[PDB]
Amino acid sequence: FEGFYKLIMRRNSVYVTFIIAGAFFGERAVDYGVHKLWERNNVGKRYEDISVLGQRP
Amino acid sequence: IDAVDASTVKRVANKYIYDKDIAISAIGPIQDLPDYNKFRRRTYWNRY
């Protein structure tokens, strides 16, 4: 808590590391959330939802 | 006084100086004096 907190606002190297970590996780969290809502809005329309998938003849 | 060593000065300076607000009182031909944001920014070093 206080240890990381105090380091972030007192050393710019820790703050830059904090920015990189927040960019990395915040980007993945949004990409995960966007894709979950894309899946909920497109039920039945995915390539893996084709009934005849695998029997061409 | 003797108790104030180099570690003491750095500790006290971090409490009173680092990234702290300042008060400015200027008079005269002071157009070239930097503004509040310039003085405010110069209270920390971003290379550390």
Binding site: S13, V14, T17, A21 | -
Partner: peptide, 28 residues
Amino acid sequence: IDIQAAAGWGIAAAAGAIWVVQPFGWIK
């Protein structure tokens, strides 16, 4: 202030390398 800052930026650079290049699978 000289070694601490050096280790701190060395950590920032290493995290940045892991962030730009994301070799999640090269941990072998």
